Amino acid sequence: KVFGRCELAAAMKRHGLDNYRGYSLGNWVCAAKFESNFNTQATNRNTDGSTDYGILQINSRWWCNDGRTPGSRNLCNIPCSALLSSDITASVNCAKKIVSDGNGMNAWVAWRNRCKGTDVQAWIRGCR
Numbered sequence: 001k002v003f004g005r006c007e008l009a010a011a012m013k014r015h016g017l018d019n020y021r022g023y024s025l026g027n028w029v030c031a032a033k034f035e036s037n038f039n040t041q042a043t044n045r046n047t048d049g050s051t052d053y054g055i056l057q058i059n060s061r062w063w064c065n066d067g068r069t070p071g072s073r074n075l076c077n078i079p080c081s082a083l084l085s086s087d088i089t090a091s092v093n094c095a096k097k098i099v100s101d102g103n104g105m106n107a108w109v110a111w112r113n114r115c116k117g118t119d120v121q122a123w124i125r126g127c128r
């Protein structure tokens with residue numbers, strides 16, 4: 001699924017993501033745009049052999065199981081494929097654990113380089 005901007009904001013906000021660990025709703029929509037292009041099916045291979053999955057490109061090294069990342073952890077206790085769903089529940093619960101773990105939204109390289117220190121409220125401007 002390719003989400004529109006307001007549509008993803010109202011989904012994220014209904015799944016509790018808004019001001020989660022003090023990160024405003026504009027920070028999450030910002031990250032999703034630059035991680036996946038709002039596209040739930042997005043995948044990218046990393047050079048160590050793991051893969052990033054879904055709208056927030058969640059890494060198979062620590063967080064989910066795809067059966068091809070040897071001696072890796074599955075801390076969200078899900079298959080990688082679950083994070084490719086049009087229903088963003090799996091991805092959201094999975095991003096709550098990651099952003100809680102000590103490093104915040106710096107886990108998202110696209111968030112750090114393109115949204116941190118900018119006008120993030122611009123990403124929800126106009127939405128009801």
Ligand SMILES: C[C@@H](O)CN1CCN(CC(=O)O)CCN(CC(=O)O)CCN(CC(=O)O)CC1
């Ligand atoms: C709502 C309009 O913006 C729709 N839009 C009209 C064309 N725009 C003109 C403009 O953005 O004023 C120029 C191109 N546009 C640049 C950008 O938006 O950054 C990228 C494509 N956009 C993506 C999007 O906007 O979500 C869809 C088409």
Ligand SMILES: C[C@@H](O)CN1CCN(CC(=O)O)CCN(CC(=O)O)CCN(CC(=O)O)CC1
Binds near residue numbers: 122
């Ligand atoms: C031509 C305009 O599209 C210029 N545009 C600024 C104004 N946009 C317009 C809008 O989308 O209504 C609103 C703010 N915007 C939210 C979003 O667009 O998704 C984030 C910043 N954008 C990033 C991008 O375009 O990728 C910078 C370029």
Ligand SMILES: [Cl-]
Binds near residue numbers: 024025026121124
């Ligand atoms: Cl915001």
Ligand SMILES: [Cl-]
Binds near residue numbers: 065066068069070
């Ligand atoms: Cl594996």
Ligand SMILES: [Cl-]
Binds near residue numbers: 103105
């Ligand atoms: Cl923080």
Ligand SMILES: [Gd]
């Ligand atoms: Gd824009």
Ligand code: NA
Binds near residue numbers: 065066069
């Ligand atoms: Na894994």
